[PDB]
């Protein structure tokens, strides 16, 4: 049988001020998504890893968020369908079990925004 | 060491910076250095 892909988990947590303060302590964890832009963040599966955990937030506006899995032309699986989230109001978080070796694509989608740039604070971990 | 799905259930239910830091100390979760992540922009 082809690999069964686990459903992702998603949740929020309220402390967005503290989250962004923590993340701001490193420049590279802060992304500017221009008007009409889509920023993709590639997160490879670690050789000792089992799960991917993500957190993200924005400053003044919502943004589209999706997760895809790239198998190592290459096959792409939809893990979290892209949808607008109010990650300016709360920290958005989620996880997914490794379906196999490959690369996760975190997509921060600002396609729909004509006039607004978004600042994206994000963080990712993995488990053994 | 607990199972990954147990970690998952914990973080989902009582998520906080404190719980993250604790899981990190125990080496249950390991942070991906953001500077090692490939970031792509597309219009």
Numbering used by the authors:
A (entry chain A): 365 to 436, 473 to 528
B (entry chain B): 16 to 58
Question: Which passages does the manuscript contain on this structure?
Answer:
To ensure that the 3A protein is fully complexed with the ACBD3 GOLD domain and to avoid the formation of partial complexes with 1:2 stoichiometry, we designed a GOLD-EVD68 3A fusion protein using a similar approach as for the GOLD-EVA71 3A fusion protein used for the crystallographic analysis. Taking advantage of the vicinity of the C terminus of the ACBD3 GOLD domain and the N terminus of the ordered part of the EVD68 3A protein, we connected the last residue of ACBD3 (R528ACBD3) through a short peptide linker (GSGSG) to the first ordered residue of the EVD68 3A protein (T163A/EVD68). Both GOLD-3A wild-type and LVVY mutant fusion proteins formed crystals, which diffracted to a resolution suitable for further structure determination. The crystal structures of the GOLD: 3A complex consisting of two individual proteins, the GOLD-3A fusion protein, and its LVVY mutant were almost identical with low root-median-square deviations, confirming that neither the fusion-protein approach nor the LVVY mutation affected the correct folding of these proteins. Three lines of evidence document the dimeric state of the wild-type GOLD-3A fusion protein and the monomeric state of its LVVY mutant in vitro. First, the retention volumes of these proteins in size exclusion chromatography are significantly shifted. Secondly, the small-angle X-ray scattering (SAXS) profiles of these proteins correspond to the calculated scattering curves of a dimer of the wild-type GOLD-3A fusion protein and of a monomer of its LVVY mutant. Nevertheless, we observed a significant difference in FRET efficiency between the wild-type GOLD-3A fusion protein and its LVVY mutant. These results confirm that the GOLD: 3A complexes are flexible enough to allow the formation of the heterotetramers consisting of two molecules of the viral 3A protein and two molecules of host ACBD3 even in cells at the respective intracellular membranes.
